[PDB]
Design a protein around this ligand. Structure first.
Ligand SMILES: [Mg+2]
Ligand SMILES: [Zn+2]
Ligand SMILES: [Zn+2]
Lengths: 83, 1355, 99
RNA sequence: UGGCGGUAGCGU
DNA sequence: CCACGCGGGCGGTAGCGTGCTTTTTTCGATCTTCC
DNA sequence: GGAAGATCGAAAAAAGCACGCTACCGCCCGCGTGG
């Protein structure tokens, strides 16, 4: 359900970091076991990542901010567990 | 060891390192035993030296399991490890005698010869065991480096005893190299070069100094150039392929190694037995020949052949070459998950879709199907999945359908020329055995459905899939990267259908009806109550875009045709109705698509394109257009016309029978008459065809555009042209002989009617000419494309803005009489270099750094601005890459160019792709004197010194005078070059009308124009000695002619004639301009009618010097000449400085020119050939860059005399002229990028504080960095002169040795890098491709900059 | 003709060519040029190392695709190793710097 | 389930 | 009287000989300018 | 005052000669010695 990504590159810019962020998001869905926020109407990871880019929910900034938050919360949970 | 990969370091390999690499020593020339497959000990293939035979298994069977991994056996001494160890394990052959390396000996210049400073022939004779060389002759007459013959050696032995040392061969060379002192020779040569100041000593001594410095700086020793222990290839790299049966496939490398080992063993045996000197000498010579064969077969003489009676392959031969390992299995390699198949057209496919066969999809996506089946649980293991796949159930088909859902596949053509050659599609399962392809994209691939085969590749990783969805997609590729025009364009049946949907009749069924909307029009058409060509009135609700982008609907009762109403259904809600109310030709469709893309965007545009394709196909099918023999109407007058033409030619022929006219004039008149007859016939046929149909319209008859099918294809532009229809129903025309001469008689019969044998035979000449032209054109186009790609591989965008305030000039190109290209398209998409000022008001029309879009171009052209300074890649100050701002707007996408794009490859491919359009073969004069203007405008004279004449008309005295007709708006419209000594109708600033003769001048002679009025005094000319009063009986007068220098005496040639202007009294006029006396030095061979003591006014023609009164290059050869900077056969001599020109004494029968400056001394007394005419006079104040003589320009000369901007302008203008003459379009930025890559080397002028050598040539970026650093530290910066190099030469001279080796030349750059110890950083696209890491152009730019910042942080 | 996982050459460990030998399509030099013309870079690495001649890369790619994970290991092409070994077989001293 | 060269032909 | 071996070239008192084009080097022959 | 630096012109050598695809032919071998 995606044939033109012009509205996606206009959202991200430079047409290059969009590929990297979409690849990271698709890897998060596929091997990372993440939950696709947008509805999944029988599609695989890459187009869910592209549509999430389109809707503006995910970009580079939100992605690494969420990654840092997950890292710090899991570190806190681990240190609580060992203590 | 990927992190270990940062650079490649090469050098000469010492014998110690060679021994360290080897795991053993090969002794016997044997291979694996034929009786038993186990390899023989100490042979070419071995087990103790190299790795074992099978994984984790001992040769003797002591251990056969991983339990004893990494354990050395003792029964046979074979390491227990994997078989792959056989690929990185080497051995060493211990040569009995030293041998020279052949790359450092035969690859010119000879490194051994250059280092030893001896002739190559002497080195070769000494090396091959036939001539003797002295090592140390002592205090006797025998010098250090002296060549001795056998008899001379014996004589010296008896005369001077045994104190002198004269060895035999490579041992002597090695001893001499060891005895040489590097630093002492370096300093001695340095001081000799300092105090020699001789041109022959200027050269070949800097090279020696550079070689000495390279040897000293690196760890390489000269003696290492002489091989003593040689390495062998790992056994797996020269495998013995098991042929069918007991036969084993022969390997050339194995045979060569066996030969070398046998030779070494024989030499060892002979040395051990103390053989006579002759026998061991011959053995050493033939060992050297074997080493020649192994290192590089056929380099010296005959190549050692084998059972095939043809030369064998050694290391060097298959390292280099087209089939060599460097460019056959390294730069491009076969890949898995790939297929190929013939293609067919499919109309039911969307723009982003392709048709894949079921078998191809099943085979290509096999691992994905296996994984999905394993996930589904249908197959427990991989073997079960394989069995299910080969059984072809329905579940495997469903799994395949799920897999392909949004997995794009890449399709490409075998001759991928331009960037759009490969594109990805979303495949869909289809039946059949052929790949269904979208019709619109076919023109992108340049692939007609006549048997062409597509190749398909399948990405797997997520990054590759996103590349497929983002950049490989065809939807994103809408604008061409060469000129920005749309790549997808409706063509053929589609547009034809639209034509049939827009043509209007007069009495068609349903005329006069009034409909409420397109829906009722469709109802009426489908019900059969009306015809598509009927003219009606319908209520159209046009939706238009207003402020804030909102849609406003306006309903109006317009008058149109029902077919246009049907077409309006698929038009989106942004376009106006006027875009449809036309005849809908091909150009109309293209304009409508462009407007739709500009207004509504790409997303509606793709759907609109799909809809128009569907509608055009359907209505072309419904139209039922067909071609018939009756549709081909021959004009009735044509025959009559031919008759009269014959009559005409007969009359002309009669004149040649009467002697009134000559044969040449007869032929010319015949050609002109036949051309006029052809034009008349074509006009009559076109008038017949265009409006043949006559129709009743409820009354009297009336005319309308004809419905003839051939006329439909001609007018709609679907396929065919006016020339082809002229050949079809008019006449074939004047055909040409293969040499180029036009045949006297034309083909007077149509293609519809019969052609006689002679006319067909005549046409076959041109047919074969064109076919052979294309056949030979393909290869040259491919070679040029490869060279251009190699030249511009490194250039990528690395920065945003340079901040440089320097840019190239931009003015519309005018060749005289027409403007070939307006300013708008040449300056479109280029960032302005500086502020663009309004003409005459000193107001900032355009700011300093703005991207010039369409609105800015409209504003620029509205204010009548013709000159714009724009930033160019040539002036891009960024080193190792270009900035985004300097390059300008990307052609494919309207936005500014993004960082990282490898514009060099884009430029190379865009320039290469029209190569098939150009023609290489040369094709096939007219003389004009007076200049006539075409438009009416003001007149302007530039670089002009003019003198008034007796009649008051101006006369040009300047060589480089330019005449320009400028429009009333202030823009130049005409530009011509007026030669020296031309009369002018009017002065500067007077309005003139079109067609007026502005200037006239003598075609075959140059007059001598005096600036003063007075009597002429015959000074410094004497009859016979200097001039001859040659008597012309036809004129009846004896006119003085200036003799040639050889004709003149010594005093006569020294006393060349000098026309001095005096007054009536007799003293010199002395010129009003300057105080030096009025002297007009007559040049050689000048003929003067004027006699002594004749009064002449200012501007009078003193004398006339005759001159001679043809260059045909072509399309491809001219482009190759321009790009490789080949020196023209007749380079025009230009002044290196500004000063007075003077003649010197003739040297070797040729002329000496001296240019004396006003202040400095004359540096240049360069020699001039006598046969080459000189445009300049004896005494003229010529400026630097002016043409001393007339001839083709040399780009190197332009670079030395003038700035790099002049060279860039010249190259761009020439290449663009050649490209536009063929009709194709290429943007100038690609040519500018190629030129910038060409100008990358600079020669130092003064060393300064930098360490750069005085005469060395280095990269320009290094000079810039060094100068900036020195300025920062306050030291004086080194001065540089940019040099122009050929594209092949520039590519071969790059810093990266790997990229240079990837080019054509090999074993020359490799040898230079080895002797120089060059270290290559992986900073290029080609180098990284050879590596296999991510290229630093695309998405790998982020990874590469991340690596660079990580390295910087580590430092 | 179509191939997914066929045989490989002994010297370059590259897919064979020709329909009769069940080989693979050849990725020409102009194909690499066009790939660099676009911004695609991971696809070039796919064409170069993982899918052609990196035996460890080939095995890891096959195992990952079977497992469903579309992740990549760059590796080192074997053709470059072949060229390095052959150049070292002459008097040249091409090698690897430690950094 | 073994591919290395060469020769000829085919489509751009 | 067979198996290893060796060097592998046809042709011929040797020399690799035949309707492409461009670039680079070399060498002999000559023109010229001073020791 | 006539040799050495500069030039010129001819010779000789190196280097390449677009990309795919298809089919078949030769991948040993013939003459010379030691058991
Ligand atoms: Mg075709
Ligand atoms: Zn063992
Ligand atoms: Zn710049």
């Amino acid at each position: 359900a995606r044939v033109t990504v012009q509205d996606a590159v206009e959202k991200i810019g430079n047409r290059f970091d969009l590929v990297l962020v979409a690849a990271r998001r698709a890897r998060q869905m596929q091997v990372g076991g993440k939950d696709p926020l947008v509805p999944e109407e029988n599609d695989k990871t890459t187009v869910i990542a592209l549509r999430e880019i389109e809707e503006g929910l995910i970009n580079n900034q939100i992605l690494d901010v969420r990654e840092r938050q997950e890292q710090q919360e899991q570190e806190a949970a681990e240190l609580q567990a060992v203590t | 060891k990927t992190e270990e990969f940062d650079a490649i370091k090469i050098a000469l390999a010492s014998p110690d390192m060679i021994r360290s690499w080897s795991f053993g020593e090969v002794k016997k020339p044997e291979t694996i035993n034929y009786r038993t497959f186990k390899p023989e000990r100490d042979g070419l293939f071995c087990a103790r030296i190299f790795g074992p035979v099978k994984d984790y298994e001992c040769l003797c069977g002591k251990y056969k399991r991983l339990k004893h991994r990494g354990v050395i056996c003792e029964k046979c001494g074979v390491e227990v490890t994997q078989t792959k160890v056989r690929r990185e394990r080497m051995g060493h052959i211990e040569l009995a005698s030293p041998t020279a390396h052949i790359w450092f000996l035969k690859s010119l210049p000879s490194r051994i010869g250059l280092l030893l400073d001896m002739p190559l022939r002497d080195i070769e004779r000494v090396l091959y065991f036939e001539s003797y060389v002295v090592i140390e002759g002592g205090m006797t007459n025998l010098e250090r480096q002296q060549i001795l013959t056998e008899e001379q050696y014996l004589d010296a032995l008896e005369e001077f005893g045994d104190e002198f040392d004269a060895k035999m061969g490579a041992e002597a060379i090695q001893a001499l190299l060891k005895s040489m002192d590097l630093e002492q020779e370096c300093e001695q040569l340095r001081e000799e070069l300092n105090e020699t100041n001789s041109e022959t000593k200027r050269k070949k001594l800097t090279k020696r100094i550079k070689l000495l410095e390279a040897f000293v700086q690196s760890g390489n020793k000269p003696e290492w150039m002489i091989l003593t222990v040689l390495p062998v290839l790992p056994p797996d790299l020269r495998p013995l392929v098991p042929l069918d049966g007991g036969r084993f496939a022969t390997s050339d490398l194995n045979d060569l190694y066996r030969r070398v080992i046998n030779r070494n063993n024989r030499l060892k045996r002979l040395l051990d037995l103390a053989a006579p000197d002759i026998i061991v000498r011959n053995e050493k010579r033939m060992l050297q020949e074997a080493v020649d064969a192994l290192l590089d077969n056929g380099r010296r003489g005959r190549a050692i052949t084998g059972s095939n009676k043809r030369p064998l392959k050694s290391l060097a031969d298959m390292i280099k070459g087209k089939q060599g390992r460097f460019r056959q299995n390294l730069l491009g390699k076969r890949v898995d998950y790939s297929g190929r198949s013939v293609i067919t057209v499919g109309p039911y496919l969307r723009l982003h879709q392709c048709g894949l066969p079921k078998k191809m999809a099943l085979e290509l996506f096999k691992p994905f199907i296996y994984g999905k089946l394993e996930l589904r649980g249908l197959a427990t293991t991989i073997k079960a999945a394989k069995k299910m796949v080969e059984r072809e159930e329905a579940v495997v088909w469903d799994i395949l359908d799920e897999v392909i859902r949004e997995h794009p596949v890449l399709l490409n053509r075998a001759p991928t020329l331009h960037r759009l050659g490969i594109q990805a599609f979303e495949p869909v399962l289809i039946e059949g055995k052929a790949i269904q392809l979208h019709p619109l994209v076919c023109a992108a691939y340049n692939a007609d459905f006549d048997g062409d085969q597509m190749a398909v590749h399948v990405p797997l990783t997520l990054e590759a899939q996103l590349e497929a969805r983002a950049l490989m997609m065809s939807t994103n590729n809408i604008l061409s990267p060469a000129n920005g025009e749309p790549i997808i364009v409706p063509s053929q049946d589609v547009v034809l259908g639209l034509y049939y949907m827009t043509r209007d009749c007069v009495n068609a069924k349903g005329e006069g009806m009034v409909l409420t909307g397109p829906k009722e029009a469709e109802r009426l058409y489908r019900s059969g109550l009306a015809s598509l060509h009927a003219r009606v009135k319908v209520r159209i609700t046009e939706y238009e875009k207003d402020a804030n982008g909102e849609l406003v609907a306006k309903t109006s009762l317009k008058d149109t045709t029902v077919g246009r109403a049907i077409l309006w259904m698929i038009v989106p809600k942004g376009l106006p109705y006027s875009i449809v109310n036309q005849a809908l030709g091909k150009k109309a469709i293209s304009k409508m698509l462009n407007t739709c893309y500009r207004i509504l965007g790409l997303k509606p545009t793709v759907i609109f394109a799909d809809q128009i394709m569907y509608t055009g196909f359907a209505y072309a099918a419904r139209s039922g257009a067909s071609v018939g023999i009756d549709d081909m109407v021959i004009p009735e007058k044509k025959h009559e016309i031919i008759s009269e033409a014959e009559a005409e030619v007969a009359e002309i022929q009669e004149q040649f029978q009467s002697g009134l006219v000559t044969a040449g004039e007869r032929y010319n008149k015949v050609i002109d008459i036949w051309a006029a007859a052809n034009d008349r016939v074509s006009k009559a046929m076109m008038d017949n065809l265009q409006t043949e149909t006559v129709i009743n319209r409820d009354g009297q008859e009336e005319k309308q555009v004809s419905f003839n099918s051939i006329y439909m294809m001609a007018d709609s532009g679907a396929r065919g042209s006016a020339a082809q229809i002229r050949q079809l129903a008019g006449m074939r025309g004047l055909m040409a002989k293969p040499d180029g001469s036009i045949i006297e008689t034309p083909i007077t019969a149509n293609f519809r009617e019969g052609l006689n044998v002679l006319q067909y035979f005549i046409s076959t000449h041109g047919a074969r000419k064109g076919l052979a032209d294309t056949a030979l054109k393909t290869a040259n186009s491919g070679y040029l494309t490869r060279r251009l790609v190699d030249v511009a591989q490194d250039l990528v965008v690395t920065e945003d803005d340079c901040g440089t305030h320097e840019g190239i000039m931009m003015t519309p190109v005018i060749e005289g009489g027409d403007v070939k290209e307006p300013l708008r398209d040449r300056v479109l998409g280029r960032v302005t270099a500086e502020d663009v000022l309004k003409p005459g008001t000193a107001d900032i029309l355009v700011p300093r750094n703005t991207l010039l879009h369409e609105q800015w171009c409209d504003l620029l052209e509205e204010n009548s601005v013709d000159a714009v300074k724009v930033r160019s890649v040539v002036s891009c100050d960024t080193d190792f890459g270009v900035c985004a701002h300097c390059y300008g707007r990307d052609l494919a996408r309207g936005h500014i160019i993004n960082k990282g794009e490898a514009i060099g490859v884009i430029a190379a491919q865009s320039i290469g792709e029209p190569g098939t359009q150009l023609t290489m073969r040369t094709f096939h004069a007219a003389a004009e004197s007076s200049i006539q203007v075409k438009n009416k405008g003001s007149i302007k004279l530039s670089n002009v010194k003019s003198v008034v004449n007796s009649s008051g008309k101006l006369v040009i005295t300047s060589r480089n005078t330019e005449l320009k007709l400028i429009d009333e708006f202030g823009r130049t419209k005409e530009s011509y070059k007026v030669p020296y000594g031309a009369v002018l109708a009017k002065g500067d600033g007077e309005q003139v009308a079109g067609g007026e003769t502005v200037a006239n001048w003598d075609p075959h002679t140059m007059p001598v124009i005096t600036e003063v009025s007075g009597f002429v005094r015959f000074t410094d000319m004497i009859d016979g000695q200097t001039i001859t009063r040659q008597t012309d009986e036809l004129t009846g007068l004896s006119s003085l002619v200036v003799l040639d220098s050889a004709e003149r005496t010594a005093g006569g040639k020294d006393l060349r004639p000098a026309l001095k202007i005096v007054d009536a009294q007799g003293n010199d006029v002395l010129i009003p301009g300057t105080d030096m006396p009025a002297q007009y030095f007559l040049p050689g061979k000048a003929i003067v009618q004027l006699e002594d003591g004749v009064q002449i006014s200012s501007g009078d023609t003193l004398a006339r010097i005759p001159q001679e009164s043809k260059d045909i290059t072509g399309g491809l050869p001219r482009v190759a000449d321009l790009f490789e900077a080949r020196r023209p056969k007749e380079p025009a001599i230009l002044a290196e400085i500004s000063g007075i020109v003077s003649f010197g004494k003739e040297t070797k029968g040729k002329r000496r020119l001296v240019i004396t400056p006003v202040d400095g001394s004359d540096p240049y007394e360069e020699m001039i050939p006598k046969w080459r005419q000189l445009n300049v006079f004896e005494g003229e104040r010529v400026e630097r860059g002016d043409v001393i003589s007339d001839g083709p320009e040399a780009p190197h000369d332009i670079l030395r005399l003038r700035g790099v901007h002049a060279v860039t302008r010249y190259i761009v203008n020439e290449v663009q002229d050649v490209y536009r003459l063929q009709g194709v379009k290429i943007n100038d930025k690609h040519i500018e990028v190629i030129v910038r890559q060409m100008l990358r080397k600079a020669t130092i002028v003064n060393a300064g504080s930098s360490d750069f050598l005085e005469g060395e040539q280095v990269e320009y970026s290094r000079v810039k960095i060094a100068n900036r650093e020195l300025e920062a530290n306050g030291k004086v910066g080194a001065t540089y002169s940019r040099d122009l190099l050929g594209i092949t030469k520039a590519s071969l001279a790059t810093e990266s040795f790997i990229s240079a080796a990837s080019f054509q030349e090999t074993t020359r750059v490799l040898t230079e890098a080895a002797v120089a110890g060059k270290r290559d950083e992986l900073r290029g696209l080609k180098e990284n491709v050879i590596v296999g890491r991510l290229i630093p152009a695309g998405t790998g730019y982020a990874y590469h900059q991340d690596r660079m910042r990580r390295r910087a942080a580590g430092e | 003709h179509a191939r997914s996982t066929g045989s490989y050459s002994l010297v370059t460990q590259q897919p064979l060519g020709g329909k009769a030998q069940f080989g693979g399509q050849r990725f020409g030099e102009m194909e690499v040029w066009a790939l660099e013309a676009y911004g695609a870079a991971y696809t070039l690495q796919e064409m170069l190392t993982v899918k052609s001649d990196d035996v460890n890369g080939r095995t890891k790619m096959y195992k990952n695709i079977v497992d469903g994970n579309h992740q990549m290991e760059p590796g080192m092409p074997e053709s470059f190793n072949v060229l390095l070994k052959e150049i070292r077989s002459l008097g040249i001293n091409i090698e690897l710097e430690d950094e």
